[PDB]
Amino acid sequence: ATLKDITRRLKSIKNIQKITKSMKMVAAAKYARAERELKPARVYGVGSLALYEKADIKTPEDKKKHLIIGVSSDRGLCGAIHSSVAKQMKSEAANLAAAGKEVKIIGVGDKIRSILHRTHSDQFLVTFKEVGRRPPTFGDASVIALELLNSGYEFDEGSIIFNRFRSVISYKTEEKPIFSLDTISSAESMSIYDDIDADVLRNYQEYSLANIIYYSLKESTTSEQSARMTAMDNASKNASEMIDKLTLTFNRTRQAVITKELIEIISGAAAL
């Protein structure tokens, strides 16, 4: 195009490249912090899961209720994090609804709410915003657990979907089940557990719910920050690879303009 057009495009792309470079720097900082904080939270959450792991509690398959808690953040620009989590949520919701179970969905983060507000718009039970702006804490998990229990929904089973942070390059959309004291009580595997009346059991269930929510928040936050680091690094590399071609074109066009103006001048001079 004209020289002015290429100049303007090149300036804008330079701006974008700088912005994404700084963004990658910031996301790297936040990810380093989050991956530092995820060490204790990993052992904490694994301990929390210990019970249901080593004394398996399968739910009686003749229930009617369920719950699907998807975990994500508000902010975008992080690869297919929210995409993968919402895809898993809807996959499970449809598979369950095939069996007639009355599912409900809780999204932690605005992105999850939005991606699923076209289909599954009604099934939403509650959703939360302001996720990922600051590192999540156990206060956040306790708030989610409270807003779940108080809501007049006595779910009989549940699943929580989040993004387990495998490595700074990869993450896996994992799902962890979560039960209800009605299921816990009537499980044969629980007969070997003493001092278990139907009260310590469901104090313990409330705490276990808070634990699993907190663990999922920490995993998802680390995964999201790593994904944003990678995405902004890729965007900066794409912008630079584009600036290469734009600079070559700009230099060609600048020389063409100089030559053309000069030829016009000398052709006028000769003509007279």
């Binding site: 060490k39 204790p40 939270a41 052992v43 904490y44 301990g47 929390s48 210990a50 019970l51 080593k54 004394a55 804490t137 156990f138 070997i192 557990y193 003493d194 001092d195 278990i196 310590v200 059991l201 104090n203 313990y204 705490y207 276990s208 634990n211 907190y214």
Partner: protein, 132 residues
């Protein structure tokens, strides 16, 4: 032997360690866990867990709340929402808070608010009586 796992959301104290005996509080009431204790689930009261390592040394951590699981395979998981070593606490503050809570106990705003005051009172009570 016992595989002990003591953890707070923020930090971790023991991780599949090998301690001899660990004394934990509870709602149903204090008890000690040994290498083959019978399986149980419990939720903690604000008290101070004491851990005795394989060699004879006692470590005391005040925990505020959480859960404790003793499993079939003799693996204890003690999760506390807030665990702190006793040296990280100050009497004056705790005693003043206990007295303040008692002072608001008269103002029985409601069964709920009464409950919160009572919980604060017993939490501070255990705080002082472990610190003093």
């Amino acid at each position: 032997q016992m595989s002990f796992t003591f953890a707070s959301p923020t930090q971790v104290f023991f991780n599949s360690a090998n301690v001899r005996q660990v004394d934990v509080p509870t709602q149903t009431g204090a008890f000690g866990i040994l290498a083959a204790h019978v399986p149980t689930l419990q939720v903690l009261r604000p008290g101070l867990v004491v851990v005795h390592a394989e060699d004879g040394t006692t470590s005391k951590y005040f925990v505020s709340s959480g859960s404790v699981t003793v499993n079939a395979d003799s693996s204890v998981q003690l999760l506390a929402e807030e665990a702190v070593t006793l040296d990280m606490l100050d009497l004056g503050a705790a005693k003043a808070n206990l007295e303040k809570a008692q002072s608001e106990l008269l103002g029985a705003a409601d069964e709920a608010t009464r409950a919160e005051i009572q919980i604060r009172i017993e939490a501070n009570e255990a705080l002082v009586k472990a610190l003093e």
